[PDB]
Amino acid sequence: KTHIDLYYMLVQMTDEFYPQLSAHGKQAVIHAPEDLTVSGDPDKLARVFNNILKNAAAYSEDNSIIDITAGLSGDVVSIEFKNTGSIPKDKLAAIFGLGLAIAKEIIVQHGGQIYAESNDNYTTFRVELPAM
């Protein structure tokens, strides 16, 4: 009988990252309906998103935007972090203090999935969680 108000969880995280991001002229912007909700362990999910943003911040190019889009489509709530810059493909095949291994099991324990891709222009992290 619980739920996470996702937009506001993402906002709080973004605000914790603001000093680190502004120092390189970066900016995280959230695109999401504010009505959007999901089930799960709130403090565990916040750590998932924190770890991912930590990765986006580390591989994001100076003076660029980190987009965090979240939406409900069918049975899936998806949260997608996209940044300009690339993860070296050897660090990328290893990705599962930037290790997303715990993030992954948290999401997996939630019945969800994490996708990471990277070309050489931008990097995408995608979290999918079951919808209520």
Numbering used by the authors: 227 to 322, 340 to 375
According to the publication:
The VanS sensor kinase is organized into several structural domains, which include a periplasmic sensor domain flanked by two transmembrane helices, a membrane-proximal HAMP domain, a dimerization-and-histidine-phosphorylation (DHp) domain, and a catalytic ATP-binding (CA) domain. Here, we present X-ray crystal structures for the catalytic and ATP-binding (CA) domains of two VanS proteins, derived from vancomycin-resistant enterococci types A and C. Both proteins adopt the canonical Bergerat fold that has been observed for CA domains of other prokaryotic histidine kinases.
The structure of the VanSA CA domain was determined by the single-wavelength anomalous diffraction method, relying upon two ordered cadmium ions contributed by the crystallization buffer. The crystal asymmetric unit contains one copy of the CA domain, and the cadmium ions mediate two of the three lattice contacts that connect different VanSA molecules within the crystal. The structure was refined separately against two different data sets, one of which was measured at low energy (7 keV) and used for phasing, whereas the other was collected at an energy more typically used for protein crystallography (13.5 keV). The structures obtained from the two different data sets are essentially identical, with a few minor differences in side-chain conformers, and have an RMSD in Cα positions of 0.14 Å (0.59 Å for all nonhydrogen atoms). Notably, α3 is involved in a crystal contact in the VanSA crystals, packing against strand β5 in a neighboring molecule in the lattice. Were α3 to occupy the same position in the VanSA structure that it does in the VanSC structure, it would clash with the symmetry-related molecule. VanSA is an exception, as its α3 helix lies closer to the nucleotide-binding site than in any of the other proteins; this likely reflects crystal packing effects.
